Amino acid sequence: MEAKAIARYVRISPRKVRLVVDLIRGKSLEEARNILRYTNKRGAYFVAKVLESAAANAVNNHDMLEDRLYVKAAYVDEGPALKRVLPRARGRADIIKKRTSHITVILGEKHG
């Protein structure tokens, strides 16, 4: 049995948040818990939330027995990007895109 959480439309760049997600993959839930707290990235917050909801969802829904949880697989896909206008020199105006991440943590049970 396995359990997930998906945070959707998180306003943060997929490239940026993917990096911390890589930090905790295949980690026991307890090392994953410690790694994000002491990681310094705006995306350690957002992942830790998804981590938990999946940990919650695991025990609390699918009857998964917390102590053996690890992170089976996990990843952030790229949501729809909001575009804004950035006025520039000589009348010019580019557009910058504030992006979006769909964070997914998927939990499964250790075999010990």
Partner RNA sequence: CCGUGAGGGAAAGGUGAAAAGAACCCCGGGAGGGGAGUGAAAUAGAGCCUGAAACCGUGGGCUUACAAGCAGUCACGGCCCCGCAAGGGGUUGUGGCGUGCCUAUUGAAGCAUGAGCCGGCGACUCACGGUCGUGGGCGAGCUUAAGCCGUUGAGGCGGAGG
Partner RNA sequence: GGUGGAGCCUGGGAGUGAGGGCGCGAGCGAUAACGUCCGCGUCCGAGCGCGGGAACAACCGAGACCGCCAGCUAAGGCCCC
Partner RNA sequence: GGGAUGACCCCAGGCGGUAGGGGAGCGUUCCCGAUGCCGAUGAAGGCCGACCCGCGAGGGCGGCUGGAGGUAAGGGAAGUG
- Where do contacts with RNA occur on this chain (CB under 7 A)? 3-10, 14, 18, 25, 49, 52-53, 56-57, 60-62, 73, 75-80, 100
Nearest-angstrom CA–CA distance, 12 and 102: 10
Which residues in 32-55 are b (16+ Cβ under 10 Å) and which e?
bbebbeebeeebbebbbbbbebbb
Q: Dihedral sign for Cα 27, 28, 34, 36, please.
A: positive
Quickly list DSSP for 59-96. Answer: HHHH---GGGEEEEEEEEEE-PPEEEEE--GGG--EEE
Nearer to RNA, 27 or 75 (CB): 75
Nearer to RNA, 28 or 57 (CB): 57
Work out how close the CB of 17 gets to RNA at its nearest, in angstroms, rounded to a whole number. 11
Nearer to RNA, 39 or 57 (CB): 57
Work out how close the CB of 44 gets to RNA at its nearest, in angstroms, rounded to a whole number. 13
Nearer to RNA, 81 or 110 (CB): 81
Work out how close the CB of 100 gets to RNA at its nearest, in angstroms, rounded to a whole number. 6
Work out how close the CB of 60 gets to RNA at its nearest, in angstroms, rounded to a whole number. 4
